[PDB]
Amino acid sequence: LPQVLADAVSRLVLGKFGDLTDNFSSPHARRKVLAGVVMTTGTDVKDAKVISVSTGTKCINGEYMSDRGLALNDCHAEIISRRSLLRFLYTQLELYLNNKDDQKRSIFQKSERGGFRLKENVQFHLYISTSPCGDARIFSPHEPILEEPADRHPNRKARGQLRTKIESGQGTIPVRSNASIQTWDGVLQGERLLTMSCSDKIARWNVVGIQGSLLSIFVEPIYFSSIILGSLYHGDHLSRAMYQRISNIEDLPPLYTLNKPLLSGISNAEARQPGKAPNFSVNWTVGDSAIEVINATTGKDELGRASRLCKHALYCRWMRVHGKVPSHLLRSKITKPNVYHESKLAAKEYQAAKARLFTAFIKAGLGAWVEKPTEQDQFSLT
Amino acid sequence: NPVMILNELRPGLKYDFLSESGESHAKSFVMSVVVDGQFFEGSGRNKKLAKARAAQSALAAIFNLHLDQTPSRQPIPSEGLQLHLPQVLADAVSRLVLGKFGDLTDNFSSPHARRKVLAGVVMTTGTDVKDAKVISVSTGTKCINGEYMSDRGLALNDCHAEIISRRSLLRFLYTQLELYLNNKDDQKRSIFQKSERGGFRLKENVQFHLYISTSPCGDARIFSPHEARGQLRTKIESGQGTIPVRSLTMSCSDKIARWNVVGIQGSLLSIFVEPIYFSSIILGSLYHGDHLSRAMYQRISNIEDLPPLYTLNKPLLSGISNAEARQPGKAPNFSVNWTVGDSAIEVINATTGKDELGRASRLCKHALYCRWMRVHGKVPSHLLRSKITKPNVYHESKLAAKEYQAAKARLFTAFIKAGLGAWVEKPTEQDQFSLT
RNA sequence: GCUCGCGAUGCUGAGGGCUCUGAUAGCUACG
RNA sequence: CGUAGCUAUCAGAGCCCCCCAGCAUCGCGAGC
Ligand SMILES: O=P(O)(O)O[C@H]1[C@@H](OP(=O)(O)O)[C@@H](OP(=O)(O)O)[C@@H](OP(=O)(O)O)[C@@H](OP(=O)(O)O)[C@H]1OP(=O)(O)O
Ligand SMILES: O=P(O)(O)O[C@H]1[C@@H](OP(=O)(O)O)[C@@H](OP(=O)(O)O)[C@@H](OP(=O)(O)O)[C@@H](OP(=O)(O)O)[C@H]1OP(=O)(O)O
Ligand SMILES: [Zn+2]
Ligand SMILES: [Zn+2]
């Protein structure tokens, strides 16, 4: 049943969080927002496993961008929990590639289309302890009211619109049709760094998948099968934000779709957390022994070291896998020089999903996507 | 970590809170201390860093220098390094410019004091830095919008501060030329003299130093200050920052590299004076020795076959002790300029290239030609460095500066040859006007 | 129904100042 | 063996200043 599934993953993610903070005692149990992914392999609750857990509510300061991929740009909890799912994807890949004995315990099989795909009946589920910023939270940032008045104004231009977190300022701000293009040059000088809101990033994952461009060179697209909120659930706002606002999307590459995961809140809504919001963010993937703590305003850990989630890390997980995947077993055969931005461009089909996405928002009056300065990915491991 | 050393090595000290400037976000506190007799000072966004800069100015003087945060903050020297030590010049230039922008705005009270980038040029007469003199002050970070571009040189294409500062330095240099030319006692005080090779040169050991509150946009700023392609970039008005050029207005970084080859005086002034180069480029923030140096000259060290007097100027590069702090937020639409001799600042809308009531700047193309024309009809035609008969149209009188246009084209190839893109010039019809 | 303007009451990441408490770290004083 | 005092740094609470540009609800005017 759907409501039992919701409360299940709600409890799973909490319990896993506690084990890592010794029953929420640890100094790093302090949070404003919790998130996590959970994997199911069958309808039995005994078949459900927590893949990752995370906290955080802030984004990097403009002047700490890393031109060599060493800083985390966006530490909103659910953004972080996807990045930790990505590590688990790279692990289950190196797992399959050890020998035929190990490869049975991987979640991937070989795909009858090229590259790899998940085995049947393995699904991932996203838990956020609050509604994702922008289109799904902005208009009702509050615990839903027993006596409804749902919206009242579903046709205002502001409904659906793409929106950004904005450096050192409140709100998630719609994309202006005047102001456009961010530059490395500029934000160092003082132009406040725009980051696309979390309701937007999750709508994107509902089209291009949760795996990213780099992993799509090995894997077929993957989707969240449910999205569960621990508090501040609003069925119409959420359904609008996660997909319905772009039901005008067309021409997606094969195996891409507009995914419509199950949406649901939980029975016992989580409680507001009192205090100043922590400026740090913790992350944990299945297979790690402890949590990692990142200063969100620096996108680095307390001693200035890069995270296991940063672009440079993930490039390196990606290369190790690249080096043992037979050129024939690739999903793309495009060759690009070994720099982060360029390897991404080798995922031609993913890049065209992306393009249809950006177009669906634009044609629907909902604004044009805001990207980071191109310099941000023009780094190499060499 | 610094004042801790000062107050554990002379532990009876107390600092006094002097002043505070600006408005709660562009606000800077100044903190002074007098340790072992002499009066130290530092500036900062918060009090604990202001007094940390003052305490470091104390530890460097009374004892010696601090933790040398890599070579990145360490100054690059020039060639024939006079005018005393680097950082002591840099701190003086910065103080002078910032102080004079004070006087120009009711000690920072005016609304026109609100700015993101501050720039200026100051002049020295060698030996002693107490002989310095601020030549020009300016602000701004926006360019003209295409809809407002002028066909008769009545609009300012580019109002990024550091560019506006150079246009003011021009105004200064026309002024000093006219000083020499209006009687024989007045040529006593002009900065120019007559040259061996024709026209005027500068009097031995007069130098100009360029200060910018931050690193110039484009190449010098493409790095992360909390841990290589010298390519050419263009501004993108519709915003701040730059885009690399593809295989529009040039980036400040590129324009200053240019001036590091063809000189700061432009074409029209070259007809009268030998090339003039900056001796220092001092940054009030975002200083990085390798990135600045590359942007400013290294990226085109493959330049060659320059006309006689031209060269690849390799000036002083230096940050400052009391660096400015990044203030995220909207950039102003206005640009302020002032040249020594002027009564007040002039205020430009950078999106219109004209001033607050729609008039032409003293810095726009038409204005500068007008002074150029007036000095031309004053100097004998045998004293000219480039013979230019019957000057009428702006673009042709520029072309008369034939040695300069050579240096321009050597520069343009030196960029292409290094794989750094091809310089973007504006449609030549914009300089097709006369004073008629 | 929506949009624009003016007003009102609220909602939701920065900077700075002054105090209360707690660890680390260095240096003093006293008995 | 203690306890006072003085600079530095990190974490938490309390107060005030300042900003930030969206969003809800309502009122008035106007348009589609
Ligand atoms: O938010 P994240 O989870 O880090 O996703 C980021 C990133 O977003 P942020 O810049 O907000 O972090 C990019 O977004 P843009 O800013 O460039 O839009 C990017 O997308 P690009 O493809 O444009 O780089 C890319 O996602 P993808 O895997 O589809 O490239 C990427 O993931 P990385 O952190 O791996 O760069
Ligand atoms: O505004 P500034 O940076 O002070 O320099 C400008 C101008 O630059 P913008 O057009 O970017 O305003 C021209 O540069 P181009 O676009 O044409 O390259 C021009 O160059 P040319 O006239 O040589 O094409 C010329 O420099 P110069 O006068 O030394 O030739 C000129 O100064 P003026 O505004 O005095 O013409
Ligand atoms: Zn968010
Ligand atoms: Zn500039």
* Distance from the B372 Cα atom to the nearest Cα atom in chain A, whole angstroms: 35
Q: Are residues B21 and B101 in the same domain?
A: no
Residues B313 and B278 sit within 8 Å (Cβ to Cβ)? yes
Q: DSSP string of A263-322?
A: EEE-SSPPPPPPSSPPSEEEEEETT-SS-EEEETTTTEETTSPPPTTSHHHHHHHHHHHH
Question: Protein B388 CA to nucleic acid C14 C1', in Å?
Answer: 58
Strand partners, B233: B244
Q: Determine contact, residues B361/B258, Cβ cutoff 8 Å.
A: no
Q: Are B274 and B194 in contact (CB under 8 A)?
A: no
| CA of residue A135 to C1' of nucleotide D24, angstroms | 14
The alpha carbon torsion through B96, B101, B104, B106 (nearest 10 deg) reads -110
Distance in angstroms (rounded) separating the CA atoms of residues A150 and B414? 65
Strand blocks (E) in A16-87 = 34-40, 48-55, 57-59, 74-76
Contact B331 A191 (CB under 8 A): yes
C-alpha distances (whole Å) from A340 to each of A308, A381, B72, B133 are: 16, 8, 26, 49
Mutate to test the pocket of ligand 1, among A187, A213, A316, A343 (most ligand atoms within 8 A of CB): A213
Among A65, A218, A371, which residue has the most ligand 1 atoms within 8 Å of its CB, making it the best to mutate?
A371
- Cα angle value B194/B197/B202 (rounded, 5°): 40
Q: What is the CATH number of the domain that holds B50?
A: 3.30.160.20
User: Is A260 a member of any domain?
Assistant: yes
Residue A382 falls within a domain, yes or no?
Answer: no
Any idea what the Cα angle at residue A22 is, between residues A17 and A26, rounded to 5°? 90
Query: Does B235 reside within a domain?
Result: yes
Domain count, chain A: 1
Instruction: Look at residue A52 and give its three-state secondary structure.
Output: strand
Q: Which domain holds residue A199?
A: 2-377
Nucleotide nearest residue A168, measured CA to C1': C14
Q: Which residue is nearest to nucleotide D8 (CA to C1')?
A: B4
Residue A123 Cβ inside 6 Å of ligand 1? The answer reads no
* Site of tokens 């990085």: B288
Q: Both tokens of residue A301?
A: 């850990």
In strand D, the nucleotides that come within 7 Å of a protein beta carbon are 6-9, 11-13, 17-26
- Entry resolution (Å): 2.8
Last residue of a domain, one of B49, B67, B85: B67
- Asked whether residue A126 is assigned to any structural domain, the reply reads yes
Q: B363: which 2 tokens? A: 């810095």
Contacts of B163 (CB under 8 A, 6+ apart): B252, B255
Residue pair B116/B327 in contact (Cβ under 8 Å)? The answer is yes
- Which has the closest alpha carbon to B254: B86, B401, B408? B408
Q: A-B interface: how many C-beta pairs under 8 angstroms?
A: 88
Q: Is residue A210 part of a domain?
A: yes
User: Which chain A residues are closer than 8 Å to B225 by Cβ?
Assistant: 63, 188
Sheet holding A292-295, edge to edge: A262-265, A224-229, A123-128, A34-40, A48-55, A280-285, A292-295, A300-301
Q: Would residue A78 show up in a list of annotated catalytic residues for this protein?
A: yes
Question: Residues B265, B392: one domain?
Answer: yes
Question: What's the CA gap between B2 and A371, in Å, rounded?
Answer: 40
A27 CA from C22 C1′ (Å): 13
Q: B142 in the Ramachandran plot: left (φ > 0), alpha (ψ -120 to 50) or beta?
A: beta
Fill in the amino acid letter for B178. Answer: E
**Residue A266 CB contacts under 8 Å (≥ 6 apart), including other chains:** A6, A7, A10, A228, A229, A230, A233
Residue B154 lies in a domain: yes
Query: Residues by CB within 7 Å of nucleic chain D, which ones?
Result: A 27, 30, 138-139, 151-153, 156, 158, 161, 163, 166, 169-174, 176, 275-276, 278-279; B 1, 3-4, 7-8, 11, 23-25, 48, 52, 329-330
Question: Which distant-in-sequence residues (6+ apart) come within 8 Å of B410 by Cβ?
Answer: B261, B303, B304, B305, B306
- Residue of chain B minimizing CA distance to A65: B224
Of B20, B41, B67, the last residue of a domain is: B67
For residues B397 and B366, state if they share a domain: yes
Q: Which of B160, B224, B232, B290 to mutate to test the interface with A (most CBs of A within 10 A)?
A: B224
Q: Is A255 among the domain residues?
A: yes
What is the Cβ-side half-sphere exposure of residue B204, based on CA atoms within 13 angstroms?
Answer: 1
Single out the residue in B67, B98, B114 at which a domain terminates. Answer: B67
